[PDB]
Amino acid sequence: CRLLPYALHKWSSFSSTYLPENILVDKPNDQSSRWSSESNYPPQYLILKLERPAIVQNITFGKYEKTHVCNLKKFKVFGGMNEENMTELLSSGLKNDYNKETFTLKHKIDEQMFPCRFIKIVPLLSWGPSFNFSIWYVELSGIDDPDIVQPCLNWYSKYREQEAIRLCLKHFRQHNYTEAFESLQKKTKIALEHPMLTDIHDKLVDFDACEELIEKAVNDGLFNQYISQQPRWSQIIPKSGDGEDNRPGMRGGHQMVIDVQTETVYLFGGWDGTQDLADFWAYSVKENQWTCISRDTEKENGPSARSCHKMCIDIQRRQIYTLGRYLDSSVRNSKSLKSDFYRYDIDTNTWMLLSEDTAADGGPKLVFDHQMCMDSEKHMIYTFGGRILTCSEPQFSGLFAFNCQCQTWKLLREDSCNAGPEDIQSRIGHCMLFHSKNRCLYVFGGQRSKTYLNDFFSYDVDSDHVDIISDVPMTGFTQRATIDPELNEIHVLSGLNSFWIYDIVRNSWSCVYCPRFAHQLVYDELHKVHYLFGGNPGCSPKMRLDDFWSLKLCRPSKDYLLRHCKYLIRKHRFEEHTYAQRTQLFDTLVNFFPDSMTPPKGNLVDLI
Amino acid sequence: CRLLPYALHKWSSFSSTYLPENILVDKPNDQSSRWSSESNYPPQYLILKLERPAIVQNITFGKYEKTHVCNLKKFKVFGGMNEENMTELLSSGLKNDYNKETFTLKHKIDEQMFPCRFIKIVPLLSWGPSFNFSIWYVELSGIDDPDIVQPCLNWYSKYREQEAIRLCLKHFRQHNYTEAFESLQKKTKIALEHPMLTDIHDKLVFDACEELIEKAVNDGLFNQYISQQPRWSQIIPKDNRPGMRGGHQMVIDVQTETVYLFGGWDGTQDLADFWAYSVKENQWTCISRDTEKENGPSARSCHKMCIDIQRRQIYTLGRYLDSSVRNSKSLKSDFYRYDIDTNTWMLLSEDTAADGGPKLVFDHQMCMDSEKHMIYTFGGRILTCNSEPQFSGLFAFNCQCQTWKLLREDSCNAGPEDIQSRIGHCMLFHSKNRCLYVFGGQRSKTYLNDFFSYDVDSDHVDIISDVPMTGFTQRATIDPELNEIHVLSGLSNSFWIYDIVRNSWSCVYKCPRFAHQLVYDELHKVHYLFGGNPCSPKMRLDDFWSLKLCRPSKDYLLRHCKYLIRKHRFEEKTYAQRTQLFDTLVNFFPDSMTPPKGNLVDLI
């Protein structure tokens, strides 16, 4: 990080006694030792040239002894080996104080360092809006050693040459001027694309056999990304005083999870606005019939009436684990605050008290509005967040973990708000989902003491490492989330109903779309169906609703894409310069594959 | 200055291994080398104790090697030699950046230096509201040499003792416990009241006593009290009346007690009518229907002009011309002079630009100084025949030598003695200070909220500011007698006053119009508002008002004091009533001359 000497290459404009060269001297005790633009307008750039090309990492700015209006409230910096090929590096803003601020300029693209020779500083807005821009002293720091600058420049030149070679090869294939060009590209053995596309190209040179290759693409889910680049609402009517007796009653804040393997859903607990509910009901996806497992599980040695609790299920063990009970000061007491934890078997239909109090066994205390997720592999029930109920400063439980194979509790992380190297901040009202495919416990949302937290991070269950993703979609009063391991996505529905989705690999949120509050949402990835039940409508203060809504994803299934490709192939097969026309279908099909392995998306004719 | 050694004294709370002692050592490479509050609640602070008492000037805050959420988005600093009582010194917020910062703590009362021994840092908000506060490294800089700190302590202790003795003497004289209490003052050689106040109190302790305070009141020492202490009156003329017009100009002669109006745009066409309305006669007398017929200017609007009381002469310069009629020959910077005494016009200069004066400008400002007979013109966007707009800078024309001189050219680089040209601003000449106060204005659609002053003799510019904001059609005028700048704004009616002595903006009286003309009077205190259109383009408002300020006056205050004295004398026909009356009257005197406020019993 040695200092990089520089010389004033060019100046858009300057004022009297404020020549640009004055930026070469760090004299804070002199107001005349600064550059000053002729006028405050967009074209006020300043191009500095380095003695030799270097990787500029940080730029240090100096200010007057006191606050000055002409200080750059907003500015931008560009770097380029040539005066024309300028790429932005920083768009921050200087302080109005006299502190010598140093900023870090973008000097790495795709985790590859890139050098620069010309640095263009373009002020955007002075602190004094009507005043001219001014720079007092700029110091450039970076790696000026040729042994470190030449290799990266050579690497970038080779990358550009490879890109040009790929573009020319694709152009030749499109025009099919001559196959010898391939041999010309084979001399370097650096232009060949992925063999997956090579098989299709060879098939082009067979017409009907390519479907087999497409099947492989379906097997590996290559088109999934394309599917991610691409809803249906349905209010289910229960199958036939049976208007409400055949279906669960109106409730809010209940719990429910969907059994993907059994294609069934379960509904327990809830609040109807008048009295807490303890009924347990089941629903089938194969029909609209609703069945009541038990109108009151309390008499069945099961959980009593409760609201704002949590419950998860394990498909492999076909188990249901429930924890949490929201209460009130009038109800809270020594024995009413015990962190009861219950386990239930669907095959045997037996309710038993797994633990009278988790806190006694070292587990989490009685927490309401917490989050729970059971690992599909190790059957570990991780519980996170939720204000601890007590009869003072609010307390939030940390990230615990339960052992289904050993019936033991442990504390993975505490409620540490100091933002340590590996620290997790407990919160309430958040959405936490265990991505089994990636094996990461993602979590977002929540309200730390009604602060409306928006931080998003992922924690590894096995590596015991927490990775911060964002110190994010729109925030609502109540939000529910569901996981899509097969598509590696998270679908979030906000309450009083915005719907947002994003891809784990891409890490880019987006919005893709019945007012319900404190409702319940479950999701089936194999069927690609979200079920939204219950909630609170939001004239009187107290209401209740019993909604039966289902949402089907708008994305096309892999089978649908395969059928479309087969139909496209058959369209040309029925009809059967000809090779060029036939290549259109192959080019269209190649678009379905991910861009990572696909050839360049640009054409030389378009570029020219 | 130099680094001031210090050690941890107290901490409200600390989380885990992040002990407060880590604040001592700077180490951005280590995250643990920091302090972190147990939680984010109002009672979260830290206290640092210096090795010995010292005058801390600046505090240096360290940072982590990378941006951190726990960084103090907002915080406060207090200083005090006893942790029991502390006084705030800084209130700012660290930026979420890895670069070390330093701030200047408020450690000065007037020109004095206040030393401290205990420094309390209380974080308020973190960049992540959920996350708790955390401080990485703090370094205290200042003067710790005893040769400087000790005299400051001696002075501050002496001042505290002086205040205490003044208060006790005030209590004694209020209660008249003893007549020898003045000996205590003799110990300090300082009296709780000024010599005039002491003499008045001795005399009063009423026919002749009244004159003693009357002389002081006539001395003008009560101006501050009067300032420390609304009367719209639409006046109609006694055929002989003006017409609807916007952008006109008008001036007031207090000695002649009249208002001269000229110019204006009535929507259909420009105007050249010159009228002279006499307040005493309430007659809107007509001077001319076309000044050009009398060797005057043409019919144009959006111009400026000043009035010379000692000469009864009007100088007019600058006019607004449409872009279509904008021609090089037609855009000459005209400059005319009118002799109201003889009612004869004269052309000072057909084109002041050639003579060295400002080019043709509109929406500029002008003022006059009869002491030197110097006319100063500032602001105004220069008109050019059909680029970046150019604004004329400060100028100065010799009313006697007939010569144009430039004082400060348009300089937007914010130099030590640079004045930024602007349009729509308010520039006023303070004769008592022989200076020009400039506030408000707009520059290339960017509203200017900077207030400054420029001495016409010392040629020195003093910036007074970097709360009327974005106030279009703001017309202001100065009152040297009251030393107050009164401003009235309008839509693109809010009214404001500015006290120069205390440098304070006060809100008073919080018809709708714009581009109106206002004239202020300092002798009769009668201010007239005319013109200003407010919807249709041809709509205009030409109602004539007699705006006035509803507040006491020096004569009114003197009359009230005399009435109170007469009432007290009549009541006279325990003598604490006279003391109470004297104390009540003392409130009229300024704070500096007045004795300490309050009473000892109020604190005991």
Side-chain angles (χ1 to χ4, degrees), chain A residues 1-176 180 191 195 209 217 221 231-556 580 594 599-600 602, chain B residues 1-176 180 191 195 208 216 220 230-552 576 590 595-596 598:
Chain A
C1 198
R2 191 179 66 74
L3 187 141
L4 270 47
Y6 67 90
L8 274 295
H9 169 63
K10 213 168 77 181
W11 40 99
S12 57
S13 69
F14 72 95
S15 299
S16 59
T17 61
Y18 300 131
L19 276 64
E21 299 102 297
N22 303 2
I23 70 183
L24 295 151
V25 174
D26 55 354
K27 265 183 76 174
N29 65 291
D30 193 1
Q31 68 90 34
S32 78
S33 184
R34 50 150 162 109
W35 175 66
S36 193
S37 55
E38 183 69 4
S39 53
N40 51 359
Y41 287 106
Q44 298 294 353
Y45 59 84
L46 183 69
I47 322 300
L48 279 55
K49 161 162 74 192
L50 280 66
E51 305 301 331
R52 280 196 323 291
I55 298 89
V56 184
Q57 304 177 297
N58 301 319
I59 181 167
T60 302
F61 286 83
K63 269 83 76 178
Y64 195 53
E65 277 176 349
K66 49 175 69 52
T67 66
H68 198 272
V69 303
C70 295
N71 284 356
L72 273 43
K73 181 174 184 293
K74 194 185 302 313
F75 77 107
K76 278 174 181 178
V77 178
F78 296 79
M81 294 299 291
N82 196 5
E83 191 173 327
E84 198 277 327
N85 55 2
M86 297 286 210
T87 70
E88 202 196 57
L89 322 172
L90 175 66
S91 64
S92 282
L94 262 59
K95 283 170 192 145
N96 201 1
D97 64 354
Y98 57 91
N99 298 322
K100 166 147 278 172
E101 278 185 291
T102 183
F103 306 83
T104 186
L105 303 178
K106 191 191 85 192
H107 66 282
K108 268 196 295 187
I109 295 157
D110 292 332
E111 203 66 60
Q112 176 49 282
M113 274 180 147
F114 67 91
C116 308
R117 190 198 284 277
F118 297 98
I119 303 298
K120 169 166 75 170
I121 296 158
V122 57
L124 267 290
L125 169 57
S126 304
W127 275 103
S130 62
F131 294 85
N132 282 359
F133 316 109
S134 289
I135 297 165
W136 316 80
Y137 169 80
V138 299
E139 166 177 325
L140 303 175
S141 75
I143 294 285
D144 200 357
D145 194 295
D147 299 357
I148 312 305
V149 185
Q150 196 60 68
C152 73
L153 190 60
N154 292 127
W155 187 98
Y156 268 114
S157 77
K158 295 294 179 190
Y159 174 32
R160 221 180 179 74
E161 175 169 61
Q162 179 52 231
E163 167 179 299
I165 289 156
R166 290 190 90 246
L167 182 163
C168 79
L169 198 161
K170 199 198 155 66
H171 204 251
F172 306 149
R173 279 199 184 283
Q174 291 157 240
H175 292 67
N176 295 299
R232 275 92 69 190
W233 275 114
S234 302
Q235 186 173 1
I236 297 157
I237 302 168
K239 180 172 157 186
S240 296
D242 287 331
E244 190 62 59
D245 278 328
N246 73 338
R247 76 204 202 173
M250 288 171 157
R251 70 195 62 230
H254 67 286
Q255 284 301 302
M256 61 179 310
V257 176
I258 178 157
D259 195 306
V260 177
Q261 183 271 330
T262 309
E263 296 185 0
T264 50
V265 189
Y266 290 101
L267 178 142
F268 181 81
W271 199 358
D272 64 352
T274 313
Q275 184 183 1
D276 293 2
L277 321 176
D279 60 348
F280 188 22
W281 293 60
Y283 175 68
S284 170
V285 173
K286 281 81 71 173
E287 55 188 299
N288 291 5
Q289 187 62 67
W290 258 101
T291 184
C292 174
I293 288 163
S294 184
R295 295 285 163 125
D296 186 10
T297 60
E298 179 162 53
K299 69 214 183 67
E300 323 299 352
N301 320 298
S304 312
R306 48 206 279 165
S307 62
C308 314
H309 60 283
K310 280 293 184 308
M311 171 215 88
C312 70
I313 78 182
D314 178 71
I315 298 285
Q316 308 190 1
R317 305 284 171 103
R318 292 174 74 82
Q319 292 291 312
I320 287 147
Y321 296 83
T322 179
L323 188 153
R325 294 186 62 167
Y326 177 59
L327 306 165
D328 291 329
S329 57
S330 62
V331 182
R332 286 172 205 124
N333 58 58
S334 55
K335 189 153 176 63
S336 179
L337 282 168
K338 313 298 287 301
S339 193
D340 54 353
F341 179 46
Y342 302 82
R343 175 185 191 237
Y344 171 67
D345 292 332
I346 66 185
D347 54 355
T348 69
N349 310 300
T350 55
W351 280 96
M352 71 66 68
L353 176 70
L354 183 44
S355 184
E356 179 165 299
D357 179 77
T358 60
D361 197 45
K365 300 174 177 180
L366 190 72
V367 298
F368 79 101
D369 198 358
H370 65 284
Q371 284 291 359
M372 185 180 288
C373 280
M374 173 150 46
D375 184 1
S376 54
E377 297 178 354
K378 288 186 178 290
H379 310 107
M380 296 297 108
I381 299 162
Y382 308 117
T383 290
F384 177 50
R387 189 212 314 287
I388 298 162
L389 291 169
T390 53
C391 278
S392 181
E393 307 175 0
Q395 314 182 5
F396 293 105
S397 167
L399 170 60
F400 287 74
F402 188 64
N403 200 303
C404 286
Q405 319 186 3
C406 308
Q407 299 200 359
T408 306
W409 268 110
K410 72 186 293 196
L411 179 46
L412 266 49
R413 292 278 196 289
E414 306 85 0
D415 169 65
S416 57
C417 53
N418 63 71
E422 284 174 1
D423 280 0
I424 289 170
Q425 176 166 56
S426 198
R427 52 184 83 95
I428 188 178
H430 65 283
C431 283
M432 181 215 68
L433 296 165
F434 168 76
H435 196 173
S436 56
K437 182 67 70 59
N438 285 332
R439 203 84 188 287
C440 291
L441 193 65
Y442 297 90
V443 60
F444 44 90
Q447 297 108 294
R448 184 78 169 72
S449 182
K450 296 293 106 184
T451 47
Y452 324 120
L453 264 172
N454 70 299
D455 59 347
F456 171 50
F457 75 86
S458 82
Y459 160 83
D460 194 326
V461 298
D462 287 329
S463 309
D464 195 8
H465 168 64
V466 67
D467 186 3
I468 299 283
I469 291 161
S470 167
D471 59 348
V472 69
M474 61 79 71
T475 56
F477 285 68
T478 55
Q479 189 175 56
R480 302 288 167 271
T482 58
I483 187 65
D484 200 10
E486 54 89 24
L487 200 60
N488 306 301
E489 288 185 359
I490 297 89
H491 320 266
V492 304
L493 195 147
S494 304
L496 316 183
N497 281 108
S498 80
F499 197 60
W500 299 64
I501 305 170
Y502 92 93
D503 173 75
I504 292 300
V505 177
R506 296 171 199 171
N507 187 5
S508 48
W509 269 106
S510 52
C511 173
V512 297
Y513 185 77
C514 177
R516 316 292 173 245
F517 188 90
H519 58 277
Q520 282 297 111
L521 188 79
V522 294
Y523 175 56
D524 185 294
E525 77 294 353
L526 307 183
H527 295 60
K528 303 278 202 289
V529 288
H530 306 250
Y531 296 79
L532 195 150
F533 273 50
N536 172 10
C539 305
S540 67
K542 175 264 204 175
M543 280 77 88
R544 61 181 199 182
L545 54 78
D546 181 34
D547 52 353
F548 292 164
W549 278 101
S550 63
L551 188 56
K552 206 165 181 68
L553 197 65
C554 65
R555 272 81 199 179
Chain B
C1 68
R2 211 192 74 264
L3 160 55
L4 268 57
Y6 71 97
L8 276 289
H9 183 60
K10 280 303 312 192
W11 45 98
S12 65
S13 63
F14 74 109
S15 182
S16 175
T17 316
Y18 309 115
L19 202 60
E21 65 87 13
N22 304 307
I23 208 172
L24 292 189
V25 67
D26 189 15
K27 220 168 80 178
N29 310 122
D30 190 350
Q31 63 91 32
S32 87
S33 184
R34 69 181 178 161
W35 168 71
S36 75
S37 161
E38 168 161 70
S39 55
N40 44 3
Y41 296 131
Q44 302 292 352
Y45 64 85
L46 197 77
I47 296 162
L48 281 44
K49 182 177 79 173
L50 277 52
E51 175 268 349
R52 73 185 60 206
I55 299 158
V56 68
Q57 306 178 296
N58 314 323
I59 182 161
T60 316
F61 282 89
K63 294 290 194 65
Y64 192 48
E65 59 184 2
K66 65 183 78 170
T67 188
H68 210 85
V69 68
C70 296
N71 281 311
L72 282 60
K73 181 169 185 176
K74 263 171 58 47
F75 79 114
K76 288 186 174 197
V77 184
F78 297 76
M81 291 265 188
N82 60 75
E83 81 186 290
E84 195 275 327
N85 193 356
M86 321 205 78
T87 49
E88 194 194 290
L89 320 169
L90 176 64
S91 174
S92 72
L94 283 71
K95 183 181 177 195
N96 204 354
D97 58 356
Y98 63 73
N99 67 68
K100 187 177 280 174
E101 301 191 64
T102 186
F103 307 82
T104 185
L105 306 171
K106 190 202 79 62
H107 62 300
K108 277 180 164 64
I109 311 189
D110 297 331
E111 70 92 22
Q112 302 287 0
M113 295 299 291
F114 181 71
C116 295
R117 173 161 49 189
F118 287 103
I119 304 297
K120 180 173 70 174
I121 300 163
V122 60
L124 293 174
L125 281 75
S126 304
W127 282 105
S130 77
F131 296 83
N132 51 9
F133 321 113
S134 188
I135 301 170
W136 303 84
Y137 164 75
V138 164
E139 200 182 0
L140 302 174
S141 296
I143 297 158
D144 57 354
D145 309 301
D147 301 359
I148 303 97
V149 174
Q150 190 59 61
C152 290
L153 294 174
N154 302 348
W155 183 257
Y156 264 95
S157 55
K158 181 63 175 70
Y159 180 59
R160 191 264 187 194
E161 285 295 296
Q162 177 63 10
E163 295 306 298
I165 187 161
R166 288 173 69 89
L167 290 167
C168 65
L169 188 151
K170 193 81 179 292
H171 182 244
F172 286 118
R173 66 192 284 275
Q174 290 335 303
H175 292 238
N176 281 354
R231 187 41 50 204
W232 288 60
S233 164
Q234 201 182 64
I235 193 75
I236 55 169
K238 272 201 312 206
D239 293 331
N240 298 297
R241 68 176 294 157
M244 284 197 326
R245 67 214 308 170
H248 73 107
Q249 209 60 232
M250 182 179 72
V251 293
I252 190 167
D253 186 358
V254 306
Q255 295 298 301
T256 309
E257 199 195 357
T258 181
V259 296
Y260 308 100
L261 180 141
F262 171 67
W265 174 41
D266 67 2
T268 69
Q269 63 186 358
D270 297 336
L271 311 167
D273 306 332
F274 195 107
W275 308 81
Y277 163 89
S278 172
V279 182
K280 185 162 62 58
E281 296 178 352
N282 191 57
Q283 179 60 40
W284 194 271
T285 311
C286 194
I287 301 304
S288 175
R289 305 301 305 272
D290 198 353
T291 55
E292 79 204 57
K293 270 55 161 165
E294 301 296 329
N295 321 294
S298 62
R300 288 162 181 172
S301 73
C302 192
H303 50 298
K304 311 289 156 160
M305 41 155 278
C306 73
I307 184 161
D308 201 88
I309 299 167
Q310 283 65 63
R311 292 178 180 176
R312 293 185 166 177
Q313 282 179 4
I314 304 303
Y315 304 164
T316 180
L317 192 173
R319 307 186 166 70
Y320 182 60
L321 320 173
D322 188 8
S323 64
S324 43
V325 73
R326 210 77 62 71
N327 304 65
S328 295
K329 65 202 293 187
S330 73
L331 61 84
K332 290 153 67 180
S333 186
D334 311 331
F335 186 13
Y336 285 74
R337 170 171 74 79
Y338 185 32
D339 308 292
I340 291 161
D341 173 64
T342 60
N343 298 115
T344 56
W345 276 89
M346 81 76 78
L347 168 67
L348 274 175
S349 163
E350 80 301 343
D351 190 5
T352 52
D355 292 330
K359 304 164 186 171
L360 178 69
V361 287
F362 80 107
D363 193 69
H364 65 289
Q365 291 297 300
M366 293 177 71
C367 274
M368 185 275 297
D369 171 20
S370 182
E371 190 277 331
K372 198 176 63 177
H373 294 287
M374 202 36 48
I375 188 161
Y376 304 83
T377 304
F378 174 60
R381 200 260 296 289
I382 74 183
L383 299 172
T384 177
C385 53
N386 297 115
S387 65
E388 300 166 357
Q390 314 186 2
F391 302 75
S392 178
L394 175 62
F395 282 76
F397 179 75
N398 298 90
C399 311
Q400 302 177 299
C401 298
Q402 189 176 1
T403 291
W404 269 108
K405 189 205 172 186
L406 191 151
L407 273 291
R408 307 287 203 186
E409 186 169 1
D410 180 18
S411 288
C412 55
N413 68 76
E417 300 289 352
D418 289 5
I419 293 170
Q420 185 170 55
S421 190
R422 50 189 92 169
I423 52 170
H425 69 289
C426 279
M427 171 215 68
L428 294 174
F429 173 65
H430 204 79
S431 53
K432 186 260 281 178
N433 290 329
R434 304 279 278 97
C435 58
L436 303 166
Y437 289 99
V438 174
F439 85 88
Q442 199 177 17
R443 191 176 169 76
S444 191
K445 312 178 184 177
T446 307
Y447 273 83
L448 267 67
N449 53 5
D450 56 345
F451 171 45
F452 74 87
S453 177
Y454 153 82
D455 192 353
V456 310
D457 292 354
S458 182
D459 194 358
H460 167 62
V461 178
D462 167 29
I463 291 161
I464 297 153
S465 172
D466 58 352
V467 63
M469 307 206 158
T470 185
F472 193 80
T473 182
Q474 64 207 317
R475 296 285 182 287
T477 313
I478 177 64
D479 192 1
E481 182 65 26
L482 183 63
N483 302 303
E484 273 188 5
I485 297 169
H486 308 251
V487 59
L488 173 56
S489 67
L491 183 63
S492 58
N493 297 108
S494 282
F495 181 87
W496 281 82
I497 297 169
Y498 166 56
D499 290 286
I500 69 177
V501 166
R502 36 180 163 182
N503 184 58
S504 293
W505 282 347
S506 43
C507 192
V508 168
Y509 181 67
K510 174 46 57 179
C511 318
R513 68 182 80 184
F514 83 94
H516 65 283
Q517 199 61 51
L518 190 143
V519 300
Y520 189 106
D521 186 350
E522 64 278 14
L523 192 70
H524 317 293
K525 294 286 194 265
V526 193
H527 330 292
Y528 307 99
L529 188 153
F530 189 94
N533 58 356
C535 203
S536 169
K538 290 184 178 180
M539 281 171 68
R540 300 195 171 285
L541 294 174
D542 48 359
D543 50 355
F544 191 50
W545 290 82
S546 193
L547 268 287
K548 285 180 77 169
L549 277 296
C550 176
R551 59 158 51 77

